[PDB]
Design an enzyme around this catalytic site. Structure first.
Site, short mmCIF file in Angstrom:
data_model
loop_
_atom_site.label_atom_id
_atom_site.label_comp_id
_atom_site.label_asym_id
_atom_site.label_seq_id
_atom_site.Cartn_x
_atom_site.Cartn_y
_atom_site.Cartn_z
CG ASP A 49 55.29 100.35 61.93
OD1 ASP A 49 56.27 100.43 62.70
OD2 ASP A 49 54.15 100.00 62.32
CB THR A 98 56.40 101.15 66.99
OG1 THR A 98 55.50 100.03 66.87
CG2 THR A 98 56.56 101.82 65.64
CE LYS A 156 56.46 97.46 65.03
NZ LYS A 156 55.45 97.62 63.96
CG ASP A 189 51.08 95.32 58.56
OD1 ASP A 189 50.21 95.86 57.85
OD2 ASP A 189 51.03 95.30 59.82
CG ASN A 219 55.40 95.08 60.74
OD1 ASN A 219 54.51 94.37 61.19
ND2 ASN A 219 55.40 96.40 60.87
#
Ligand SMILES: CS(=O)(=O)c1cccc(Nc2ncc3cc(-c4ccc(Cl)cc4Cl)c(=O)n(CCO)c3n2)c1
Ligand SMILES: [Ca+2]
Ligand SMILES: [Ca+2]
Ligand SMILES: [Ca+2]
Ligand SMILES: [Cl-]
Ligand SMILES: [Mg+2]
Length: 456
Positions: free
Chosen positions: A134, A171, A136, A155, A139
């Protein structure tokens, strides 16, 4: 005796709530003795656990072992009957996403500074068989409000252990096409970094849309273009890198290592020491010689408190030096990077390099590389480059003592081993009998302090 000790409540004091992030709530706690502030993640066990507690604590211990200037740092994993407390370092610079809104676009020099850090961290995770899944700008966090401070990937790693319940549209921009089909290999991260790099240089997602649906339609096809007017001014090297990262088929897509070593990164990221760095640079070398002169037990004790109890503000001077010594930008100092840095240190003072420098580092490497990783990570570097008077402040020695004293008042020879063994991994009880003036056989706090000051 421990009936009213709280484990997490014993050590930390909640200050406020920062936010609510997917897995659980995130709070700002504060060590009661040292006054240092951290960020803890509270995750309800019953509601979130997919596996057992023995398996969870195994994964989070692996995360506590990750040492990289661009990867989040987790200090420990406490627990009560209702939750897990994951204590980690606090970062105050904000999300990179906010940095994209403010600046709206980045010169190739700036974008190469940011993206080089995302590549180094992602490369580190992959070598340790960790996939973000994830990645991006939301984060990635800047460690401070200083100008060119490091970014920090956060994270991640919790998916296998906990359950997430949830800005989903944000996302969609960064997912790889294979994720739509159920694949989550290491390459999905490279794709995400490629979408980030596209966004840094243009300010537009390569796969654009006002809603979650349209975006995913463009991602599936994997088609993007450099059609925006602002791409006409952007170099061909940059575009070749983005094209390699956004290759549709993962088997043909390049790796994080290839991202980091791409020529475009080398051209715009050649940070190197200058005459202004000489003061802080000489303090590090002098404390590194004092490091190798100290014994094996003393060196391991300094590494325990340099990696478990320090904060980045105290090491801001040494963070810059570590960055300038990191030629390959992989986040670590190999032997060659130590010799060259020690040689430049000579040339900036005005001294001829011609015990040789090469034979000095040869003997110094086994002492600093207490984990045997083949290179000096940041924790080992600060453990040897820092003024020992800083590491052994009273408040920081109090915390150390309470960490090892299960029960009350006294540290056994067995309980004391936890400090040295955690770092060196190599039974000398001599320092114990010398530190025990009362002949008690156990080390109270005042004998503990006297013992550490000798290590200085
Ligand atoms: C929330 S905030 O109000 O936006 C806000 C304001 C101002 C500063 C911060 N800083 C911050 N510093 C560290 C962390 C660490 C973690 C974390 C995640 C997974 C594991 Cl396993 C362990 C940890 Cl410690 C985290 O989740 N978050 C929250 C997301 O940023 C963190 N935040 C935040
Ligand atoms: Ca976004
Ligand atoms: Ca290196
Ligand atoms: Ca090491
Ligand atoms: Cl193209
Ligand atoms: Mg005693």
């Amino acid at each position: 005796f421990q009936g009213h000790m709280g484990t997490f409540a014993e050590r930390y004091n909640i200050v406020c709530m920062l936010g609510k992030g997917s897995f659980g709530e995130v709070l700002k706690c504060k060590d009661r003795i040292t006054q240092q502030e951290y960020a803890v993640k509270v995750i309800n066990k019953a509601s979130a656990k997919n596996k057992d507690t023995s398996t969870i604590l195994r994964e989070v211990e692996l995360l506590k072992k990750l040492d990289h200037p661009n990867i989040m740092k987790l200090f420990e994993i406490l627990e009560d009957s209702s939750s897990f407390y994951i204590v980690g370092e606090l970062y105050t610079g904000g999300e990179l996403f906010d940095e994209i809104i403010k600046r709206k676009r980045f010169s190739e020099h700036d974008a190469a500074r940011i993206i080089k850090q995302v590549f180094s961290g992602i490369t580190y995770m992959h070598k340790h068989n960790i996939v973000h899944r994830d990645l991006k700008p939301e984060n990635i966090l800047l460690e401070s409000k200083e100008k060119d401070c490091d970014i920090k990937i956060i994270d991640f790693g919790l998916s296998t252990c906990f359950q997430q319940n949830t800005d989903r549209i944000g996302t969609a921009y960064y997912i790889a096409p294979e994720v739509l089909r159920g694949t989550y290999d290491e390459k999905c991260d490279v794709w995400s970094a490629g979408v980030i790099l596209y966004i840094l240089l243009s300010g537009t997602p390569p796969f654009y849309g006002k809603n979650e649906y349209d975006i995913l339609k463009r991602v599936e096809t994997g088609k993007y273009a450099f059609d925006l007017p602002q791409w006409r001014t952007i170099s061909d090297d940059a575009k070749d890198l983005i094209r390699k990262m956004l290759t549709f088929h993962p088997s043909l897509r390049i790796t994080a290592t290839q991202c980091l070593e791409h020529p475009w990164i080398q051209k715009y990221s050649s940070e190197t020491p200058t005459i202004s760095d000489l003061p802080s640079l000489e303090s590090a070398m002098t404390n590194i010689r004092q490091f190798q002169a100290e014994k094996k037990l003393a060196q391991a004790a300094l590494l325990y408190m340099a990696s478990k109890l320090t904060t980045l503000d105290e090491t801001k001077q040494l963070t810059e030096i570590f960055r300038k010594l990191d030629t390959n930008n992989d986040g670590m100092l190999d032997r060659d990077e130590l010799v060259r840095g020690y040689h430049e240190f000579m040339r900036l003072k005005g001294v001829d390099s011609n015990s040789t420098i090469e034979d000095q580092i040869d003997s110094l490497m086994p002492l600093l590389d207490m984990d045997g990783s083949g290179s000096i990570e940041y924790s080992e570097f600060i453990a040897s480059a820092i003024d020992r008077t800083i590491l052994l402040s009273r408040e920081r020695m109090e915390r150390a003592f309470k960490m090892f004293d299960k029960d009350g008042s006294g540290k056994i020879s067995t309980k004391e081993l936890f400090k040295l063994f955690s770092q060196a991994d190599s039974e000398l009880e001599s320092i114990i009998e010398q530190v025990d003036n009362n002949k008690d056989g156990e080390v109270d706090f005042n004998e503990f302090v006297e013992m550490l000051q000798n290590f200085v």
